[PDB]
Structure formats: C-alpha cells, structure tokens
Subunit: 325 residues, 4 copies
C-alpha cells in the first residue's frame, strides 16, 4: 500500500490516541518544506531576471530569509506551538496567545550558507519538544536537553527532496513527489549500518585538531590492522553529510578546535536533532565527553562539538579520545 | 534584458553564420537535461509506489541523451560512459558532430541524494570517411563546445565555447534555462581544495606535499577549507564558482587516474580553460592528451590558475 | 492567516471531536486529485511521444485507478461507486471503514480532445445499513450526504468542498502541491444573469423548459436578456453558476426521458454544493437530494443555481403541469 | 521520431533558407506562453495568501509577451488588446516582424476558471518607413504566421503557417511543446454550433433562421449540439478538433460585431483557412478586410466549410 506523510502520521496518531496537535504541527512543517523546496529549485527565477520586464519583483528575499519566514508563519499558524527558536533570530519567538499550542520548536530553516551559490545540497533541521514548565511561555521553555525530544528530523534539498522524521519509535524517510506535492513513504524504520567505510569532516582545520581527532583521522587513512582505509566525503552542508552517514553508514565529525573550542554547530537546532535521528536509527552522537542528547543547554544559540554515525565508528573515536586524557 | 539558452545560442549562431547544426544539438541536449532533472527530482515517484495500484535513473538518462541527440540530425558518433562502444548514428539522421557524454555522473550517490549531473563534450568530425569510434579519439583542444548540467539544490547548465563560459539556471516553473552569469571567469586564486583524502596511503609524494601546504601554508596565510562532495560535477562547479582546486590524481593504485578523459576530464578541462582556469594531468594540459581508448582514464588537477600552478610547481620538484 | 485544506479539515475535525475517518478520506481524495491534475495537464507526455526512445493508459482509466486506490487505502470506505465501473466496488474487509463514496473520476472525457475543463465529482455518505457492504449502500438520497464537492481542472485546479456547515473553495498551488483556502463559506447570488444548457435539444424540450428559456431571451418584464454559457462539462458549468450566479439546466427530453446526467455522482453532489451555498437544485417534481435512488447509474433531470432563478423556472414548471 | 516546437520550427527554417528571425520570434513567444501558463495555473499563489507571513493576470501576460517579443530582436511594432496604441520597439531592438496579439483572451472570465488563451498574428513589416501603427494595418491575407495557446485542461499551442496547421502540447514537467498533431485539417461538416444565444432578441434575421435550422433541421436530420464557452480560444479550438461552426456576427449594438479584427478574428481566420475551413464576416472573408483602426471590430463566422457555406446561403437569402 502507498503511503503519504500526512496519511501515515494521521494513522500513527490515531493509534496513540494523542490530541492531534503533533500531527497538525508536522503537516504545517511539511507545507513549509514544500515551499522552501520549490524556492531552492529556483521556481520563478526567470521573473527575477526580467522575463516580464522587471515590473514584478517574497520573490526578492534571499533564501535564508524566505525559508525562515515560511517555517515561522506555518508553525505560528499551526496552533500547535508556543516558543520557536531559529538560527535567524537572537531571541526565541513567543507565539501570539490566540495561536498558542503546547509544543516548542527549534529549527535551522536553511542549513548550508556558504553553499547556495555553488548549488550544493541544503536542508531544514528541526527538533520538537513539549512545553514542560507551567510558567508563561518564554525562552526558557526551549532550554531542554535532546532527551526530551518528541520528534526531530530534517528535509534534505539535494538531487531530490527528502524528509527524514524520527520519533521515539524509529526513523522514517519520505521522498517528496514534486509532481503532486506529496511526501511518499519510501523507507520505514530505518537503521544505520553498524560500521561504515566513510569519515566526514573539514580537514582544512588540520592545524587546529585535538590530538585525539588527529589520531582518529590517521587510523582511517593508515589502518593499524592493515584493513582498507576509509573513503572521505565532506559536503560542508550538515544536512547532506549526516543523511549520507545515515544511509551509507560511517562517521561525521565537527569536533572542537581553535576558531571554536566548543565546536561550530548549534546544540538546539543542529546537533540535537541529528543526534536524535541517529540514536533512534541505532547510531551514536557524542561531544566526546557525553551524549549530545544529555547536554543541558543554558543558551539557545550555544555550540557543541559533535561526532556521530555508525556506532562502531563512534565507539572507536571514543576509545581514541579516552586514550588522550 | 532577460535571455534564455536557446535564444542566446540562436543569436550567437546567426551572428557567426554557421549552419544551425550546433544550435540544434544543444537544444536537443537541453530537452534531455530538463527531462533528466525531472526524473532526478523524482517527479512521478508516487506512481512507482502504487498511487494508482522500470529503469533506474542512469539507464533512463542515457536513453534521453542518446535519443535526443540521434533525432537532432546533428551528430554522427556518440560516446557514453554507459556503452562499451561508440554508437554510430544511422545514416538518415546523421549530422557532423561527435558527442562524448556521461549521462548521469554520480553512482555511489543517487541513493544518498547528493548532487549528480550530466557532462558532455562536442567535437566536430574532421575526416570525410564513414563515421567510426575513431572519430571520438580527438584531443580536448578540438572541442567546439563542452559543459555540464548539475542537478544540485537547483539545476544549472554550464556551457563553454571558444568565446567563453556561460551559466544558465533552469526555472522549473516554465522549463527554460535562464542566462544568469555571462562570460564567467574563475577566481585567479581560491581558498578551497577538493579531493578524496582517503587515498592518502597511495598518494604520489607531490600530492602529499601539496596537500600539506593547503593545511600548513608556507606564507602563514590561512589554511584552505576542504570540500569533497564525491560527485565531480558538484565539486567542479563549486571550484568554478568559489575558486580553489579539485584533484583526482593518479595514486599508485591506478596510475592513470580514475576519471574518464573523453566525457569527464576533457569537458571539465575545457570549461576551466575557457574561464581563465587550468586543468593538468601533472605532465601536460588535459586538453592536449591524445586518446587511444574512448574509455581511458586520466588524472585531473583543475581550478584557479594560481592554485594549479602551485600544485604543478610542487609536481616538478618531485622528479 | 493562510490555510490549507489539510490543515483546515484537520482543525475542523478536531473541534467536532469526530474519529478522523472523514479527514483521512478527504486527505486521500485530495492526493488523488493532485495526481489526476498532474496527468490532465499532461506532465510527462513527452515520454509517451518517445523522448527516451521508441514507445500507456487512458486518462479515464488512470483517474479512476487513482481515486479507487487512494480511497481503498484510506481505510475509511467500504463501498465505492464510479462512473467508470459497471458495478459498485466493495472494499476488502481488512481495509473497510464507515464511508460510502460515489464519484465521477474524470467528468468530461468527451471534452478531453478539445482540451476544455474536465473535473472530478464526489459525494460521501455514512454507510447506513448494517448489512454486509453492497451496492444498496450507495442508494441513499442526497439528503443523507455528509460531504460532497468537485475538483475543476480548468485554467487552474480548484477544489470545492461542501459539508453541512457550508461550502469552501481551495486553489491548488501546483508549485507546492497544496490546496490553498481562497473562499470561505461561499454563497450563491440570490439572482443571476446567465443561463446554461444545451439548447440543441430544443426540438425535444418540455413546454416548461421551452417557455423558461424564452423568458431569458425575451424577458416579458422588458429587462435585459440573460447571457448564455455552456461548456458542456458539468463541473465547469456548475462552477460558473456557483461563482457568478444564475441557472444550469440539463432537463429530461423526449429522447432521454429520465434525464441525461447521473444522480449518484453528478446531480446529487452538485445539488448538495448548491443547497449548502444557498441555492437550489430540483427535478421540477422534487429536490434532487430527495430522490430515492434505485440504481447506481440511474439518471436524473436537474435545474440548479441561484434561488430566484430556480424558483422562476419552477413557477414556469407549475403552470405547465 | 519525437519533436519539439523549437526543433521542428528550426528544421523547417533551414529548409526554407530564411534568416532565422521568425524562428527566434516564435521561440521568444513560446517562452512567454510557458510563463503565462505557469501564472494561469496559479503556481506560487500560496505566497499571495500569506504562506510566508496583485497585478491583473492579463496585465502580467501582456508584459510577458511584450518583453519577450521586444527582446527577441525580431519585432518592430506590437499591437496588443491590452494597449491603447501600437507599441514601437526601441531602435536597437527592431526586427522585421509586426505582431498583433491578445495576451490573455477570455480573461474577464478568469474568476470562473474557464479556459483562457493567447492569440497572435505575425506580419512582415511592409514599408521601410519609421515603424508606426500603420504597419499593423495589413489584411490577414498578409499573415506570415498565426495561432494561439489554449490554457485549458492542458496547455496547447496551435501554429498556422503557409504550409498548414500544427498542434503542440506543452509538457509542463520539462517546459517543451511536443508535436502531437501534424498538418491538421478541420472536418468538412460538423455537428456543433457555438454562439451566445443571449443576444437572440437582437439577432440578424439570417442568424435567427440559421440557428433555427440547427435546432430543427428541415430535412428532418439530427439537430446539432450547442456549445459556447465564452472564451474565443476554447470555442475555436473545439471547432477545429471536432468541426462545426462558431459565430460572433453583426447585429444592433454591433454592426461590425464585438470581436476585434487584428488580434482575434484574423489569427483565427488564418488558422481556419490553413486547416481547410472558412471564416467570413458575412460580406467578405475575414482575411481580406483591410483594417483602418488597430482596435477595429469585425463580425466573424468560422469553422467547417460546409457549415460556413450553409450560413452564407441563409445570409444571402436575407441580403
Ligand atoms: C513513532 C510513532 O509512531 N509515534 C506516534 C506518532 C504520533 C503520535 C501522536 C500524534 S498526535 O498526538 O499529534 N495526533 C493524533 O493523535 N491524531 C488523531 C488521528 C486520528 C484520529 C484521532 Br481520534 C486522533 C501524532 C503522531
Ligand atoms: C463543515 C464542517 O466544519 N464540518 C465538520 C468538519 C469535520 C471534519 C472531519 C471530521 S472527522 O470525522 O474526520 N474527525 C476528526 O478528524 N477528528 C480528529 C481528532 C483529533 C485529531 C485529528 Br488530526 C482529527 C469531523 C468534522
Ligand atoms: C510552414 C513550414 O513548414 N515551416 C515554417 C517555415 C519557416 C520557418 C522559419 C523561417 S525563418 O525565417 O525564421 N529562417 C530560418 O529558420 N532559417 C534557418 C534555420 C536553421 C538553419 C538555417 Br541554415 C537557416 C522560415 C521559414
Ligand atoms: C561562442 C559564441 O559566442 N558563439 C558561437 C556559438 C554558436 C552556436 C551555434 C552556431 S551554428 O553552427 O549552429 N550556426 C547557426 O545555427 N546559425 C543559424 C542560422 C540560421 C538560422 C538559425 Br535559427 C541559426 C555557431 C556558433
Ligand atoms: Mg546552519
Ligand atoms: Mg561517470
Ligand atoms: Mg461523467
């Protein structure tokens, strides 16, 4: 039987006898994802370039901004949210009381900034929490560890557009059919391969690597047990590198260095959702000192080192990292 | 004022007083590329999954290019990564151009959904005899045109001819390639280096040393950023757009390289050179290699002129 | 704020505290409609004409397959009646839900070649009998409808959805594959200035129809004559009547003495949209929604549209009986 | 063998040894039609409705045809239904063609989502005088090309030249017009009549009687069916594919009809005659009327030859 995102989550929520708020939230997010995807593929660009004589110029917003406006407005209008956090805004957004719902959403609306003009894959990252404080909604309601996530996932705008959705029961992948604006379930209950043959990180920072990271990269290029060396792949858009990690197995790293001794990626709307997806797919995601989902944040925009992927590959890193204490 | 690929090639062709054949070829090619793009973006994937109750992409893409070029009446010999021998166009559909192409580069890659693309090179048939596979065996310097479609976050067609390089963005709302970057010239020096560092075990000493200079620069300029998508069209297009260098060098475990000269290296070398960049094997300009096999491999180092010269300077050292 | 049909229906179902079966059905139907729309607009026809080399299914058949399969897999239906199928389709026990659905999947395939508007009409009933599901479950009068409407594949693709609360109009934005709410709680004009019917049957008309048409062309009260429009595709003609007002007629004639259009999946849904939007829909003898069907493909006369216009016709009809 | 409009028109032009200007005009025109089609199908309408937190469609359509034709370098005078005066292309862009068009016909009824259409007629400029509105005052006999795009269930482009009539279906997945019917001919006698019978009180006695013969055939044959969409493109296209007759004749409020000669009646009369049909005002063939005003009106009765002839017989009976 064919299944669409909207239908599949509708049925799953019926089973759980939930209130239908999470389902509304997801549906609204999917609409935003379809609009962002249409914009990323440059629908209408000919009007930007004067096909009508440059009387017709949204449309003129940059994709960062449009993407953020779409997720914001769509989540606001889902009636399912009360506090929203984006890489685009300094302070958490507090939803109009008439629109307030029970969920808290942290999201990167368009990950892949140094990378749109070259046309590499970009994505949307999201993580969804429930409001736990009894207080008025405020920035504090977004300061929860990744372990409190009810749902996280991402949309990858690559050669095709895919939405990966993780909840505590597992991870599902939905391919967008652009001919009908529907997310087709193509892979239920995904699990990451136990050990992969790809390592992923920016090696240009080699001069700033911790010696534990320097050694782990060495072990993949010159295996001590004379096993075959891993292959290297680094897209530089975190949504693409993590998805490849999910689908082919292996390891992805943005560890701590000099330009960022706490890593570069943000905990609430980059690191936590990829950790949540990975753990629920049978993978790992560590800062080196702990599980990413256990870091209790104090700033919605705080960074964190992240090392994730196939569990055997992350354990191996963890061994090399203990050895350097 | 707005322009489209087909309009632009049509006026540039009329200005040069040619026969229209190359314009026909490229328009047929454009149609194939838009149909490949549609399949890569997975239009109609819901029917494959039983929404109403059979080829993989690379076979489909080869058929799209093969057929669109045969019926253009502009070609005589067509070489594809997908076919062991050259396809000779049947006599009634024969034109004077030879096309070598990769219909869909990116294979360890479709299933993880990162950028794929079509690469192509167009040679004019010199000889007056019956077309054969020999006619595709020309150096890249004889290229009349070359380029690539990148099915990235959006679909872009890059077209290099003798005059220069132009970039056309596909607007899927109307299915037109829109001219967005005219007479593109690559940065003289870039800040990104691109290669699979998993082969460090097998690198020739010069690569090992040149890479080290990117990580620990001998003039205390900042290290280069590293980027490697694993899809040559994506890596080469980023190189053209932001500058820097792309390397698929001869390791000692395939001393001729991995990428294919006629339909991966030569087109990318042509695009680089016509945009003021370079592309070398280490021993000569990629475009100067004389081929003996339509499927032969070459090592490739291309990108910004100062970056390629720098790798070459290291390369001469190691002799 | 912006609203989509998926969000709107979902939010309305939550307030109403229903079980979600209707919402599920409506989500499946919307998905099938987007796929019919894509095929009707001929996306991919290059492949039919050999773009990939020397080389599937009529639009009629594919459209029916799309509605059939999406409704079956919604788990919300038990009996499905289609213009395309001689017999009512009985849903497999393991995918059976509460709802009976009667539909024309592609209304107007005698108009596909000339490329004019086609459409999908649908009416949704709660299964009423407790018997094993069968054709009889589709024989309810239109009064019993819980939801009805159509999709118009015209210059753009619209979906009109009627429930007991009223009529809403959704525009398909094909860039995102989302049905966007553009008209909330629409109501037909009290009186229109257009009349719509195939006047080529004039030789076979009843004297009532004959007199009513004359009043439109030569108004005894010397006011301006009505304009005439007739696409010959019911979804297009009914939709114009909704948005612009007036009257649409497909009466019986001597050659088709029970009428031409079909009661279960053309007249009843259109009558339901019309009544829920403040209009009327009659056979002349009774309200269309009050006819008790006996056969799933039976035909009915219909005269529908702006209330003043239908009442006028009925005044002409009563004079002649 | 598959064919697209651009390839087909281009190959035909090679064979006729033309300058290529007409090919370029038509390609420009095709691109405008794909852009009008996208807008008519409401692509992007969600953004107008607040999805991210209002030029009339036919004004945007006019801008698209205007701008693509100006920048084609094939035109010099543009006459649109949307514009009071002829538009004069700027000197540096002037080509040799005059184009008369309705950018979005039936578009005062876009609200009912009925079919809309684009109608066009392409003339060769006849004098060397500074371009002016007088260059559009040619009789339809002088047409080099004419046709229309129908924005209906699908988008179709119908293109009439001297050789005949071809129908191209737009595949929106790839933005190509595919040749689906070559050298179309209207059938000799039809069974549909099309006109607004709301005008019955003001009809010419010949129109009253002719239509009465459609409903009550004196040879006791089967009556015709009636259809009237109210968008000329849809009514004429159905007349073309199914045969029959379409009427917007003269009467009271209109001794010269309501439809306009240059960009409604002439292109449709040209399409009809190239398909073997007819198109009359009653007194003269539509294509022979010499216009004096770019917006002047003409009565029109067109379609299958047997049917138009039968109308003219009733018409002469009342003359
Ligand atoms: C991993 C997994 O499958 N989790 C369950 C998915 C799920 C759970 C709960 C919801 S909900 O609370 O937002 N929606 C819900 O309960 N909807 C509903 C649907 C149909 C009928 C009814 Br009465 C209620 C969503 C998804
Ligand atoms: C015109 C009008 O407003 N009619 C009422 C609309 C309506 C729509 C759907 C239903 S239902 O039977 O399908 N119930 C339903 O969807 N419930 C529900 C509950 C909790 C979560 C969800 Br996502 C859905 C009833 C009435
Ligand atoms: C009726 C029919 O069969 N074909 C239309 C004939 C036609 C079309 C276009 C032109 S042109 O004026 O634009 N000239 C042209 O296309 N020239 C051309 C094209 C390609 C190669 C060459 Br060498 C020349 C004329 C006639
Ligand atoms: C680099 C640059 O800036 N320009 C060269 C581009 C180019 C493209 C096509 C051709 S060509 O060989 O194909 N020449 C024609 O096509 N001429 C033509 C003739 C009649 C009608 C039409 Br329509 C076109 C030559 C050069
Ligand atoms: Mg980011
Ligand atoms: Mg290859
Ligand atoms: Mg029907």
């Amino acid at each position: 039987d064919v299944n669409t995102l909207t239908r599949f989550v509708m049925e799953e929520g019926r089973k759980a006898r939930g209130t239908g708020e999470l389902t509304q939230l997801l549906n609204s997010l999917c609409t935003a994802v379809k609009a962002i995807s249409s914009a990323v593929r440059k629908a209408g660009i000919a009007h930007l370039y004067g096909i009508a004589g440059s009387t017709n110029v949204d449309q003129v917003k940059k994709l960062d901004v449009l993407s953020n406006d779409l997720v914001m407005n769509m989540l606001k209008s889902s009636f399912a949210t009360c506090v929203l956090v984006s890489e685009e805004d300094k302070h958490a957004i507090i939803v109009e009381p008439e629109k307030r719902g029970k969920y808290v959403v942290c999201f990167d609306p368009l990950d892949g900034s140094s990378n749109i003009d070259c046309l590499v894959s970009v994505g949307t990252i999201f993580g969804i929490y429930r409001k736990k404080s009894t207080d008025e909604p405020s920035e504090k309601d977004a300061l929860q560890p990744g372990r409190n996530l009810v749902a996280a996932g991402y949309a990858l705008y690559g050669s095709a557009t895919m939405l990966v959705l993780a909840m505590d029961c597992g991870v599902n992948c939905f391919m967008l059919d652009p001919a009908i604006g529907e997310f087709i379930l193509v892979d239920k209950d995904v699990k990451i391969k136990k050990k992969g043959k790809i390592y992923s990180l920016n090696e240009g920072y080699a001069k700033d690597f911790d010696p534990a990271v320097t050694e782990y990269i060495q072990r993949k290029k010159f295996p001590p047990d004379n096993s075959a060396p891993y292959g290297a792949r680094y897209v530089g858009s975190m949504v693409a590198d993590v998805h490849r990690t999910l689908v082919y197995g292996g390891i992805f790293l943005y560890p701590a260095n000099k330009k960022s001794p706490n890593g570069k990626l943000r905990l609430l709307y980059e690191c936590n959702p990829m950790a949540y997806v990975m753990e629920k797919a049978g993978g790992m995601a560590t800062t080196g000192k702990e599980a990413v989902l256990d870091v209790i944040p104090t700033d919605i925009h705080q960074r964190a080192p992240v090392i994730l992927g196939s569990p055997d590959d992350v354990l191996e890193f963890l061994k090399v990292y203990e050895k350097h204490s």
